[PDB]
Design a protein around this ligand. Structure first.
Ligand code: SF4
Ligand SMILES: [Mg+2]
Ligand SMILES: [Zn+2]
Ligand SMILES: [Zn+2]
Ligand SMILES: [Zn+2]
Lengths: 459, 443, 86, 46, 43, 166, 130, 58
DNA sequence: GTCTGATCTCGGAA
DNA sequence: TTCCGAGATCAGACGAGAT
């Protein structure tokens, strides 16, 4: 009866950065966010109804599970929702590329102003077997060189000019023509797929029609537990653009709230063209790149004041008892530390050579070894399972003095559990740390896997 | 023009096959591409690419030419592939202008692509005799008579001389005596002749019956002396107009001369530039009439009157209320018919400016509706692609319960409602594409 | 809150609609040819076959398909009624 | 309807209460202030 | 641009959480257990 | 029955490093591909041979040994030309159920083609009269996963005559 | 001043002499009326209860300039002050029609494939096919 | 962290199957830091789409 | 609150 | 005659960590 099924994880080979056309934005989202400019919090017991926090989107609190999965906040990802912008508006991230394309393509036939030779000269360049980012961004200069010299096409013969970038997020083409994002959408619809690679947009990633926004993905609720406030400010304005069309108003205000929606869509991305946006979550020493992807906070790590101890070997740090009872190393049970871990699990998390967590052999939750019988857990301890024994002497911790200026500021050390709350090391190894004992503190990480224990000790 | 490429994927899928579509549609997507490069990028074996290009050069969809590298880069012309949609209409006007014999001449010329005279007359000697009475055999000499009779009015033109490059192979393209020389159909002559029906129906349904016939006989005697790139017809005198009138008419010369100076002086204006320019706006106006009622169509004609005089008169010049009117403007704006505010000259201010004036631009509203009509036939064929694969169980039962048969007659009502509706939107393409080709220089 | 109820509508109904199956009488002639050539273009020599089915089939065996008056007279006239270019 | 929000003393070491003051603030709402002694002889690190 | 980057260096393998190939991840390790490409059975 | 050449990345955990690989992979691959129908392939049974075993990597995580293994496994897949011999382990009024002997009780014959005395009338009547033979006729498998059986067969019985038993 | 008026009641009254058109025969030039249309505007149209019995040419000509946009005759010689050639002619539609049910729907334009609005199952073609 | 992407159209699909292209077959779990998953899911929130193309461990 | 390369406008010349 | 040099204005950034 059973049919075969594979259960195997994989690894990243490459990342192909692309866009989603606004028909792909809709069928990668589970709910419409056409609902209220209010926060979906109701008057009584503030629940969530259709809003901008539908809960099929994500989860902001531990008690409320999301609806499109059954899972709670812990092990559920985000799910996507989408809002429909009434009037299409410029994406401020791709906005320099829209002027970069409207300078290349004709403003009447939507072909690139080139000969059939220069096109074939550049398309011969693009089918090179070796292609770099340098060999791409070099061409987009050169193709915008030869196209911003011409004034008559070869494919329609109509007359083009310059694209001058008037003001904030507006376009002027030479009482001169103004290209609002309403006219840009169908001009980018009429670029041929012949001329899509010549603007260097790899069309497997995304065609130029989706540089501007007519739908918009709202981020899931699990990655926003103040950017929600910028989303409801859109759907407020997405009704003001919906009401005033069927209400009757002069175009200098319907072209103003379209301008006000143009900024508000752009303000949700960048906010320095008060509330941070999606740019400011990826920027500076606080954003996700420089501080959450590289410089991320770390478990099993402590920090005290240092004091000298010449009576240690150069390779040993004296670790306090109270710290060594907290920082734990998962030492798996392997026929040589079975009697040693049995001897120390009877001590439990109060005597220092002891333990405070046992996983069973199969992901059973770590059994906090304080409440139960330790001797019943000692005898039932078998091979394979994990014991989180204390930081014992002979374990490999690694220092760091926080202004790390050279390679020697992180160094491994064997760990001997001494009787105090200071990190005490030999004073010969203090000029690598540039550490005097005038109240200086320095951190102590504790590597968990056995592969990262040898990489500390040897290297 | 991605929706255009959506149709060329659909048009080849129904006619020949799938890999001849795939290698075909990729060549539309990457252009001047050699034989080995096409087989490597589509992931197709080289034996099937040689066959697929062989069928594609036969039906004149892919053209080959080498310049510098000594390696032939094939190239597919996009706008030819959509002319397959007009194929049964190309059959029909050869039945109104020629007999059943010559109607079958342009048929197997459109079907099998490149034909010699020695083959196509031999084929219609099979098809027309098998439908006629045995013993009353259709004589082939009348076919050779009507074969040249098509060519003297230049409905069939010959293939350009073959390059005969080393990479190209002569043996594979012909399908297996005399050699002869090949030709396709002159479908460009049809696009004159389909335009000839377009202007004669434009006058007859507007001016009078006798006004249109003198337009027809003007254009029927100006066929070979012009081309499609002619900005207007060759100039004629009124004395040969009285010579070229049909024998059904009896009108005196001087009364038709009054109608001749009447027909020369109109808002319509034979100015072939103004003719397709006036017929395209009626195609636009028949779409807003189709979609937004006569009230919004009334303000749609108002912007074709005044170029940049708007929103200070459109509430007055149509007398409809300000609430009801301004939703019609913004619906004409949001669907790109009303074009835009190209008059604002106050600097960088949506609130404070010299007041934005609406203005229709005829070509941006043209190229969109052509792109829309390309999108439309994608939704037509894909439905007929949808309803086909389910009902295959009961097509061969005739070759059966009461809901089983009832699904078939609701299918055959549907497909015949779809397939007829592929052609009624097709006449909007040519009426607008000929307007597109008439305003395009250097092509 | 004024629109915070549901997806705007399942569909939006336009009070004015399409006219008819326009040009009703004469496209009976083209309309059969739409279906006539499609009956003959698919059943033509200028098509391809799924040889990937036969490389997919390892069950090949015998007895299955997987295993298995023009009345005219001579003449010759070659006309240049057509263009002399390209 | 009552959920208790117990104000607990975290610390690491123990602390003795010295004073507990009871008053109204400006908007009279019964403020209560504790005061926790702790004596530390200066050991290694200080 | 449709930029397909491979994941190499260290500023991306740290972001992606791959063991970087610079240093200890340059080579890779095999095992030396009892194995051989064996003969099959006659069918 | 038919051989199927297959390729799998078989992970030996590090407490089996005493045993020889080609045996200890084979003990894993039997636990991976037994009684499991592979879609468009058939019902895998056991391991025939390991035709090529390549070199035992050990990855930066697990510490185990991952050998990519080319092998051949015998599978069950009727060739649309086989007259099999099974047993009726069930009778439904729409059609009989035959089962190959302790192999798979998942072969479900539709019954429309035998001699014009055909009905199953819910009192377990096999056939209205004039081991059991079977002609497996079509391949039919349905991939199960669909949201957050599977080799069924259709089995015929023509005018064989069945000289021994009716 | 007359904003409380429905000229859509009067658009048919300035239309129905141009639908009948006695003597459609082409015996002569048939240079056709605009002054008699100003003549029928001043004294009496088809019957209707009208508050603005005062007859000014500046308030009565405007119903024409709407009805030209509703496909009725252009102006020939209105450059004269009161009386000149003033040629006019009611324009019958120069085309047939050109649309389909799918030309009507704005939101249904989004689809491009089987998606949430895929045309393999749209409501509109299902409605049109009966 | 532990995340599920799919082979074709490679994008974050929750649990057993990916919502875009509901076909559930290509979906193969990755192992990733959560902060990188939060990068992908806030990149995809604006129009930058990191389309991962996986590969098996060699 | 500068330090920054880029990218836009002017102008004098073979 | 056009094109390239030289005049203005514009960017994103300006160390670790700690309580
Ligand atoms: S069918 Fe496809 S195209 Fe025609 S309307 Fe419905 S959705 Fe738009
Ligand atoms: Mg110091
Ligand atoms: Zn969920
Ligand atoms: Zn141009
Ligand atoms: Zn997917």
């Amino acid at each position: 009866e059973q049919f075969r099924e594979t259960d195997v994880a994989k690894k990243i080979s490459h990342i192909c950065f692309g866009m989603k056309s606004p028909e792909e934005m809709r069928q990668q989202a589970h709910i419409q966010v056409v609902s209220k400019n209010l926060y979906s919090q109701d008057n009584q017991h503030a629940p969530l109804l259709y809003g901008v926090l539908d809960h099929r989107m994500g989860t902001s609190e531990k008690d409320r599970p999301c609806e499109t999965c059954g899972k709670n906040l812990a092990d559920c990802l985000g799910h996507y929702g989408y809002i429909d912008l009434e009037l299409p508006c410029f994406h401020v991230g791709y906005f320099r590329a829209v002027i970069g394309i409207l300078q290349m393509i004709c403003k009447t036939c939507c072909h690139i102003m080139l000969s059939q030779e220069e096109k074939k000269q550049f398309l011969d360049y693009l089918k090179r077997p070796g292609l770099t980012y340098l060999q791409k961004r070099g061409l987009k200069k050169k193709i915008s060189d030869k196209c911003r010299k011409k004034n008559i096409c070869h494919h329609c013969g109509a007359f083009n000019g310059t694209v001058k970038k008037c003001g904030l997020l507006k376009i002027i083409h030479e009482a001169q023509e103004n290209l609002n994002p309403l006219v840009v959408l169908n001009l980018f619809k009429r670029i041929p797929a012949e001329d899509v690679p010549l603007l260097l947009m790899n069309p497997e990633a995304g065609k130029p029609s989706d540089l501007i926004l007519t739908r918009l993905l709202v981020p899931p609720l699990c990655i926003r537990p103040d950017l929600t406030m910028k989303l409801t400010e859109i759907i407020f304005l997405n009704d003001v653009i919906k009401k005033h069309r069927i209400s009757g108003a002069k175009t200098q205000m319907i072209m103003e709230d379209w301008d006000f929606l143009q900024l508000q869509c752009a303000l949700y991305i960048n906010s320095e063209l008060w509330t941070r946006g999606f740019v400011q979550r990826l920027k500076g020493k606080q954003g996700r790149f420089r501080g959450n992807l590289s410089g991320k906070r770390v478990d099993f790590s402590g920090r005290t004041v240092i004091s000298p101890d010449p009576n240690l070997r150069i390779d040993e740090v004296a670790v306090p008892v109270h710290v060594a009872k907290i920082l734990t190393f998962p030492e798996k049970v392997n026929k040589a530390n079975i009697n040693f871990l049995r001897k120390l699990v009877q001590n439990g998390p109060e005597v220092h050579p002891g333990a405070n967590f046992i996983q069973q052999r199969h992901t059973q939750m770590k059994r906090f070894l304080k409440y139960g019988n330790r001797e019943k857990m000692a005898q039932e301890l078998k091979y394979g399972d994990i014991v989180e024994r204390h930081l014992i002497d002979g374990d490999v911790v690694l220092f760091n003095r926080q202004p790390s200026l050279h390679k020697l500021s992180i160094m491994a050390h064997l760990a001997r559990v001494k009787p105090h709350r200071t990190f005490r090391f030999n004073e010969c190894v203090c000029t690598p740390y540039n550490a005097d004992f005038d109240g200086d503190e320095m951190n102590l990480h504790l590597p968990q896997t056995e592969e990262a224990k040898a990489e500390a000790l040897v290297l | 023009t991605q929706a255009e490429i959506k149709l060329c994927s659909l048009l080849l899928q129904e006619h020949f096959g799938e890999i001849v579509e795939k290698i075909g549609v990729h060549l539309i997507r990457t252009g001047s591409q050699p034989l080995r490069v096409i087989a490597h990028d589509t992931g197709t074996s080289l034996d099937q690419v040689k066959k697929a290009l062989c069928v594609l050069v036969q039906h004149n969809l892919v053209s080959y030419q080498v310049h510098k590298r000594g390696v032939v880069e094939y190239e597919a012309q996009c706008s030819r592939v959509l002319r397959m949609l007009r194929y049964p209409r190309y059959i029909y006007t050869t039945k109104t202008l020629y007999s059943d014999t010559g109607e079958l001449i342009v048929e197997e010329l459109l079907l099998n692509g490149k034909l010699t005279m020695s083959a196509v007359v031999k084929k219609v000697a099979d098809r027309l005799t098998e439908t006629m009475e045995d013993g009353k055999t259709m004589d082939y000499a009348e076919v050779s008579n009507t074969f040249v009779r098509l060519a003297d009015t230049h409905f069939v033109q010959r293939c350009p001389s073959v390059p005969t490059t080393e990479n190209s192979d002569p043996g594979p393209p012909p399908p297996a005596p005399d050699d002869g020389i090949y030709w396709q159909a002159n479908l460009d002559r049809f696009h004159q002749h389909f335009r000839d029906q377009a202007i004669v129906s434009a006058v007859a349904n507007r001016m009078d019956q006798t006004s249109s016939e003198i337009v027809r006989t003007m254009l029927r005697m100006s066929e070979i002396t012009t081309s499609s790139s002619a900005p207007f017809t060759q100039p004629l005198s009124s004395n040969e107009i009285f010579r070229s009138l049909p024998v059904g008419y009896n009108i005196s010369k001087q009364v038709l001369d009054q109608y001749l100076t009447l027909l020369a002086d109109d808002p319509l204006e034979i100015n072939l530039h103004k003719a397709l320019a006036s017929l395209a706006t009626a195609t636009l106006e028949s779409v807003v009439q189709e979609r937004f009622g006569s009230r919004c169509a009334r303000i749609f004609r108002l912007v074709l009157q005044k170029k940049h005089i708007e929103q200070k008169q459109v509430e007055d010049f149509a007398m409809i209320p300000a609430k009801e009117a301004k939703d019609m403007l913004y619906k004409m704006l949001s669907e790109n018919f009303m074009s835009l505010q190209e008059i604002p000259k106050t600097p960088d201010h949506a609130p404070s400016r010299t007041f934005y004036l609406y203005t229709v631009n005829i070509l941006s509203a043209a190229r969109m509706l052509l792109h829309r009509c390309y999108k439309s036939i994608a939704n037509l064929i894909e439905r007929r692609q949808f309803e086909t694969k389910e009902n295959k169980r009961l097509l061969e039962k005739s070759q059966i319960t009461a809901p089983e048969r009832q699904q078939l007659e609701t299918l055959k009502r549907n497909v015949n409602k779809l397939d007829a509706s592929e052609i009624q939107v097709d006449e909007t393409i040519f009426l607008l594409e000929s307007y597109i080709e008439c305003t395009m220089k250097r092509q | 809150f004024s629109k915070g109820e549901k997806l705007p509508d399942v569909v939006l109904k336009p009070p004015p609609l399409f006219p008819d199956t326009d040009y009703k009488p004469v496209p009976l002639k083209t309309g059969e040819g739409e279906e006539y050539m499609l009956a003959l273009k698919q059943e033509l020599r200028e098509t391809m076959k799924r040889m990937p089915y036969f490389i997919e089939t390892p069950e090949e065996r015998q007895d299955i398909e997987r295993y298995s008056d023009w009345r005219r007279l001579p003449r010759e006239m070659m006309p240049r009624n057509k263009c002399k270019k390209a | 309807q009552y959920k208790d929000v117990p104000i607990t003393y975290k610390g690491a070491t123990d602390s003795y209460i010295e004073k507990v003051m009871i008053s109204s603030n400006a908007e009279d709402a019964f403020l209560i202030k504790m005061l926790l002694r702790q004596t530390r002889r200066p050991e290694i690190g200080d | 641009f449709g930029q397909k980057d491979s994941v190499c260096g260290v500023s991306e393998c740290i972001i992606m959480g791959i063991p970087m190939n610079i240093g200890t991840g340059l080579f890779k390790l095999l095992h030396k257990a009892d194995r051989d490409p064996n003969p099959p059975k006659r069918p | 029955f038919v051989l199927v050449e297959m390729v799998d990345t078989v992970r030996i955990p590090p407490w089996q490093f005493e045993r020889k690989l080609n045996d200890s992979i084979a003990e894993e691959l039997n636990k991976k591909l037994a009684n499991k129908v592979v879609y468009n392939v058939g019902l895998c049974i056991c391991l025939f041979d390991i035709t090529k075993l390549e070199d035992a990597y050990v990855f930066p995580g697990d510490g185990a040994s991952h050998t990519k293994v080319h092998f051949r496994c015998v599978v069950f897949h009727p060739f649309l030309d086989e007259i099999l011999i099974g047993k009726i382990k069930g009778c439904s009024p729409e059609g009989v159920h035959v089962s190959l002997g302790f192999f798979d009780d998942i072969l479900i014959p539709p019954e429309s083609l035998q001699q014009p005395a055909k009905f199953d009338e819910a009192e377990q009547v096999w056939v209205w009269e004039y081991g059991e033979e079977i002609r497996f006729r079509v391949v039919d498998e349905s991939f199960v996963d669909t949201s957050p059986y599977t080799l069924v067969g259709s089995i015929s019985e023509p005018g064989l005559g069945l000289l021994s038993w009716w | 001043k007359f904003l409380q008026s429905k000229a859509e009641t009067a658009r048919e009254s300035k239309q129905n002499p141009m639908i009948q058109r006695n003597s459609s025969f082409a015996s002569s030039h048939e240079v056709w009326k605009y002054i008699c249309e100003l003549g029928i505007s001043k004294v009496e149209l088809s019957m209707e209860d009208i508050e603005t019995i005062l007859n000014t040419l500046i308030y009565d000509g405007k119903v024409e300039m709407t009805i030209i946009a509703a496909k009725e005759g252009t102006v020939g010689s209105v450059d004269g002050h009161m009386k000149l050639y003033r040629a006019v002619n009611p324009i019958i539609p120069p085309t047939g029609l050109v649309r389909a049910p799918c030309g009507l729907c704005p939101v249904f334009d989004d689809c491009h494939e089987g998606g949430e609005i895929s045309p393999s199952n749209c409501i509109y073609m299902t409605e049109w096919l009966e | 962290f532990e995340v599920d992407v799919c082979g074709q159209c490679g994008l974050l699909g929750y649990s057993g199957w990916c919502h875009y292209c509901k076909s559930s077959c290509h979906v193969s779990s990755l192992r990733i830091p959560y902060a990188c998953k939060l990068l992908f899911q806030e990149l995809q929130s604006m129009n930058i789409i990191p389309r991962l193309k996986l590969s098996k461990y060699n």
